[PDB]
Amino acid sequence: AMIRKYRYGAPFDTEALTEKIETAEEAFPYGEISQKEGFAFTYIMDEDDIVYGLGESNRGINKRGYCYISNCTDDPIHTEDKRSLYGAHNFIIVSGKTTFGLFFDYPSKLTFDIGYTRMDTLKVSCENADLDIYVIEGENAYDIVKQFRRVIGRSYIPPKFAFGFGQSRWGYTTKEDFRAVAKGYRENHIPIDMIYMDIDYMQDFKDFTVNEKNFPDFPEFVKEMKDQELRLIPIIDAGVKVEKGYEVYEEGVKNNYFCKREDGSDFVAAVWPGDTHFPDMLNPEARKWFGDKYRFLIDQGIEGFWNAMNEPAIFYSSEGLAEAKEFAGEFAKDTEGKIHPWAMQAKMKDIVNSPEDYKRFYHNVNGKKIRHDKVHNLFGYNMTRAAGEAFERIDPEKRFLMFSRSSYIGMHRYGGIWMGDNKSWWSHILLNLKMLPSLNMCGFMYTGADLGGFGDDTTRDLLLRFLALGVFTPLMRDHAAEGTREQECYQFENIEDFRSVINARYRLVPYLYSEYMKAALNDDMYFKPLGFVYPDDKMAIRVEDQLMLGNEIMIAPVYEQNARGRYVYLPEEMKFIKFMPDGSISEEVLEKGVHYVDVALNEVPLFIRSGKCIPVAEAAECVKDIDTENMQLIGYEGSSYTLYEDDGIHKDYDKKENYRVLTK
Amino acid sequence: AMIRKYRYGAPFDTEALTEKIETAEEAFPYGEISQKEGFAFTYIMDEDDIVYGLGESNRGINKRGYCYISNCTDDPIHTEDKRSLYGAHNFIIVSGKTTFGLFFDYPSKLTFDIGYTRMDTLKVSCENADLDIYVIEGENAYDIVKQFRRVIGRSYIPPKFAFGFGQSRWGYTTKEDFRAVAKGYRENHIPIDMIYMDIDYMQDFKDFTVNEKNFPDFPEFVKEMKDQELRLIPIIDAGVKVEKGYEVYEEGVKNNYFCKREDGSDFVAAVWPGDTHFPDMLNPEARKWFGDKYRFLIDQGIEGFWNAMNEPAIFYSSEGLAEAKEFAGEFAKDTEGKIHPWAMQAKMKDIVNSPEDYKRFYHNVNGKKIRHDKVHNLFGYNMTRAAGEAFERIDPEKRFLMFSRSSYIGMHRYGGIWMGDNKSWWSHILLNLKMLPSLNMCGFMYTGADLGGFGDDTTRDLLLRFLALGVFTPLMRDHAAEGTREQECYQFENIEDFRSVINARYRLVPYLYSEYMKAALNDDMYFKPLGFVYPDDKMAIRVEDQLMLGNEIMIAPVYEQNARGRYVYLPEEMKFIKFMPDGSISEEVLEKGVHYVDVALNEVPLFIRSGKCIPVAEAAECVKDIDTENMQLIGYEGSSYTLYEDDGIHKDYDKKENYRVLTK
Ligand SMILES: C[C@H]1O[C@H](O[C@H]2[C@H](O)[C@@H](O)[C@@H](O[C@H]3[C@H](O)[C@@H](O)[C@@H](O)O[C@@H]3CO)O[C@@H]2CO)[C@H](O)[C@@H](O)[C@@H]1N[C@H]1C=C(CO)[C@@H](O)[C@H](O)[C@H]1O
Numbered sequence A, B: 001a002m003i004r005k006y007r008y009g010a011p012f013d014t015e016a017l018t019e020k021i022e023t024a025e026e027a028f029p030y031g032e033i034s035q036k037e038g039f040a041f042t043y044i045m046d047e048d049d050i051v052y053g054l055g056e057s058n059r060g061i062n063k064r065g066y067c068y069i070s071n072c073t074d075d076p077i078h079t080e081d082k083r084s085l086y087g088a089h090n091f092i093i094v095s096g097k098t099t100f101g102l103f104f105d106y107p108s109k110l111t112f113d114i115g116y117t118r119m120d121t122l123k124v125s126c127e128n129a130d131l132d133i134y135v136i137e138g139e140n141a142y143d144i145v146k147q148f149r150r151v152i153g154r155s156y157i158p159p160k161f162a163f164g165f166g167q168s169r170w171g172y173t174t175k176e177d178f179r180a181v182a183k184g185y186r187e188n189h190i191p192i193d194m195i196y197m198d199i200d201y202m203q204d205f206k207d208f209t210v211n212e213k214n215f216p217d218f219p220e221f222v223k224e225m226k227d228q229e230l231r232l233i234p235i236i237d238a239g240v241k242v243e244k245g246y247e248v249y250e251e252g253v254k255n256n257y258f259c260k261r262e263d264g265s266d267f268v269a270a271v272w273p274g275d276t277h278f279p280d281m282l283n284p285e286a287r288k289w290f291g292d293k294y295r296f297l298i299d300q301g302i303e304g305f306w307n308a309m310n311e312p313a314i315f316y317s318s319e320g321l322a323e324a325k326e327f328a329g330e331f332a333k334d335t336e337g338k339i340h341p342w343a344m345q346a347k348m349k350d351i352v353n354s355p356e357d358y359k360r361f362y363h364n365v366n367g368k369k370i371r372h373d374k375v376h377n378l379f380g381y382n383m384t385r386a387a388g389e390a391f392e393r394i395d396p397e398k399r400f401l402m403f404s405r406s407s408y409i410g411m412h413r414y415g416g417i418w419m420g421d422n423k424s425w426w427s428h429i430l431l432n433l434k435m436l437p438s439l440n441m442c443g444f445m446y447t448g449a450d451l452g453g454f455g456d457d458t459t460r461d462l463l464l465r466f467l468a469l470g471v472f473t474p475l476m477r478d479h480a481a482e483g484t485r486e487q488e489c490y491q492f493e494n495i496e497d498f499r500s501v502i503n504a505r506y507r508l509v510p511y512l513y514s515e516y517m518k519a520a521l522n523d524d525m526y527f528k529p530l531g532f533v534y535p536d537d538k539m540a541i542r543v544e545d546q547l548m549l550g551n552e553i554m555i556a557p558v559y560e561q562n563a564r565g566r567y568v569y570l571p572e573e574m575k576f577i578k579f580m581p582d583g584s585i586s587e588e589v590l591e592k593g594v595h596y597v598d599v600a601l602n603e604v605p606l607f608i609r610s611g612k613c614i615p616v617a618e619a620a621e622c623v624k625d626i627d628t629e630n631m632q633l634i635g636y637e638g639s640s641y642t643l644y645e646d647d648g649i650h651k652d653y654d655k656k657e658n659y660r661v662l663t664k
């Protein structure tokens, strides 16, 4: 009754919504709709309007002032000009004199022109008028976000061990490599729960295999690590290698489980393994078949996974390759200088993630063929769903760690997201930061960035400041591209500073897990923009480098190089808290208003709100060893905090026994 | 105060310094010098040390925390990872408990590892121990900079019209193209003094030609523009087109003025015109010849030039083109996928600005041949030198507007610099801001960035914020690359806001010009880091997004999208001044400390120091029409300002009549 659905044309059913809403009849409530040039919604914003939403997209929390295109793409360079990243999250809220929310349930290229062409004009457009548009009324943005979280279904809930720290690198390939990562953290008493396994752990990049030479006794090595509270988290990619005798390949061909060209041939895309086929993620039998394959790893004691390249990413097709080799031949013997090297270079680039490739294959949805570009943004979503739904068939009682690169609203039910291939840039700390509340609005709460920066070479101080933000993000992992400077914590001087920052994480795990569980079970946000908590404060609403977490604290990470502190704005009196390197916890009461606060490199800051407190455990080196029986309570005297806690493994969430009231 | 010179091996004479310093024979006074593997200076920094310097290079004012390689390169993507931009400015100051400046007078690839490898370690190294190292000492960093400015000789001083606003775009081609730009500005009563002519004004990109089809009577068109106080500033590039009958070409080949390969043939490098030769800029006869060619344009009424592509940039050599074609041929006929597309993609990229190409040509220096790589960073410097020296021969009492892309210390005497191919990113406003004081330290005072962003698509608000920074940079011009969204001030709605911002530039010209002249004539800085003005204030010395200008004011531009103000730190009491859209000047006193200030998109902010004032003229539409007879004084009652003022055209600097003391 607070939300309505306006259907246009004959929309593909994306299954984003868990709740069935009936079709409205009245004219569209806001702005103007047009079908002349495909589809277009146009709305004139008031000058003070703020625009929230779009989950994992570029730029700031207030999306006004640029162009965002929902079209999942494998782009490893996240600069301010980019209009499309990995995610398609078609939820926005207009917040101001007139406030309302909009969800565009449409699975293809969707363009959000938010004040880019004209400052006061918001224009959302697509090629085909086949979509549902949900209008969500409410008092304010926050109320609107909660109604939306309601109808998209509960967010994915990870096992507790996943709130620990994790370390990965594109390049770990042997037992020796993993044993050295283990030794490096454990011997230095740096806390850690997870080590990620990247594509080198497979036999020639074949999904659902393990390198036979390097891991001849894999179940035994997995237990070797698990005995140390180190859980190996292996990657699975979208592309299944074309290879005779490889069982996943044979089965997909034989049973027509792969995406096909119009002529019914299995479509070929080059990725890490060379030529591959894509499983048909939109076909239920194909999804079930692919998901069940996870059994092969779970049977060996693996308790979590990550999916990459699920846009799906294409290095080139067979068609593109031939086109490029042909153009190259021309260039090769162009004596007249009619073919310039930049044309040769543009062609080589053009065959990567080519829009024309996305037009070359089809999904078989219950007998009916649909051309992939028409449902492009659903591929990653349905690949993750394949996995989620298999975990439930395989072990219904157990929580698995699961997250993916590309996504669509609806996938938030089956796994988290990481923010993809960022860079070792200071601007990416703030990018990681600003994406958080937006991802929360779209149901994606288990999320984080590659700490230290995935691409390029990091520095000791950059890695330390990344980690201090990572302290607060449910996914906290250090991951690095191949060829980059090594960025495990033990690669730098004065390693005690890394132990100090990660200790802060573990000491906060009971509290952070608690807020996440509370938020997930009540369709609420784990991170909130300040405006959500302080609607009446015209200064607060425009703050973009601070976030509220739960109902107790605010975070404000340092993201400028060489800085020894930062400016903050406090909408209410708060206690400025710092996790000090000696293990202590400094406290200072600061009043409402502007402040500059000192935050050294080896110090982790946060603020505790007036009349609140939070529990803080003593430092432990893994999640299982954290002591929750007697932890200190930091914050305001006389206040109380409701701690959610369960076994962190199963799905028994209701029980009154999961809650205890702590009182300072 | 003190300067010493330490000589290693047999340095190339760069002519950086104008003052002679005797060679020191005592121990090197700071850090360690090693010559076991080429050359390396190693210094252990104290923890609070700030490192200033490096002029035009990546990142912030404090250079600690990264790696900078002086190696002039044509790179249009200025992201945080880049180690080399256009500039090779080998001056750094270590500032802390122990303070000292070092200038590394070396013309080739020099690597500054400033806390990159180990946080506490500063390491400067190069391939050959053939260089001079100047050690400067004094009270503090500012003292040390001023002594450096003395020995490198007086900075280039532009004509007063160059303190106007200028408009450019790669694409202006015909007389209609230019008249429309003139029309767009003059009819909307937006001030402007200059329009830039990019490469398309030439006949087939030939240096020192004009397209005689589009400009049949060029000198008349030049006058037609000048009669409206609009001065065409044409570009000149380094590569002279290979073309029989082209006199510049024929003369260059005939007299051996071009850079030759090892065998004596004229080296061929492809640029805008296709095949070109490079004038041998380090050869005195060659320089005089090339420089003399500017007469062609001056004779037609041109009073300013800019140079680009003077790294020199190389799209490819004949040698590299042949290589890439040979590789493309193998890729083309490869059937066993042994040659992957990304290898083809890499080769294509590797032929641009190839380190191998910089080893393929030589300079003839007074009869001695030197391979170009060994003196690479001197090329752009000497190209700008050729122009400046030609100007003095042509008319020694007259100032020409001149600036270049690539440079080396010493070039600052002959022309200014623009910050090259930036992007329409909010983060480049900050990049622009931060590069300024560093450039000043190195003698480059006439400088600025492409306002609104060169590459990629700008927005109305990004342009307006970029122009409010431009108001204060001596070079203020809006420039864009081909294929970008058009970003002339008149390409946007509510054009009055652009009038307002440019109007502030013109109201401040008398003051900004006065400040520039006083700084230049006194070997002093126009822009200064807060640390130089408030050395004892430990908060002020860490500020990197505010700058002192002259001795009267401080600037603090907004560089955040959607921001309606920003945090500022005032190290003393100041008057907060804004030039309002309505042409009024808001004023508010603010005590020392941290403040949040409101700055609307259409307001230009600055601060006036306690006990100071500045002259503010009424808005005019060109420099010539500014009424400096009776300017309003803004700031503190009872304060005095010394206003420098000459004809802005000739070089009659030393008249006492040039100075007039004003008191508020
Ligand atoms: C110093 C150097 O510059 C000379 O060139 C011009 C200057 O750069 C201008 O600044 C300008 O100077 C004027 C004064 O500022 C002004 O107050 C007036 O009183 O006198 C000047 C007239 O405008 O004009 C200069 C005119 O050329 C000059 O070209 C150059 O030679 C000077 N360098 C020395 C070189 C020699 C060679 O023996 C001698 O002439 C002197 O020792 C130096 O002047």
Ligand SMILES: OC[C@H]1O[C@H](O)[C@H](O)[C@@H](O)[C@@H]1O
Binding pocket: A315, B341, B342
């Ligand atoms: O061509 C796409 C990819 O090809 C190879 O995988 C390269 O290793 C990688 O750097 C590139 O992005």
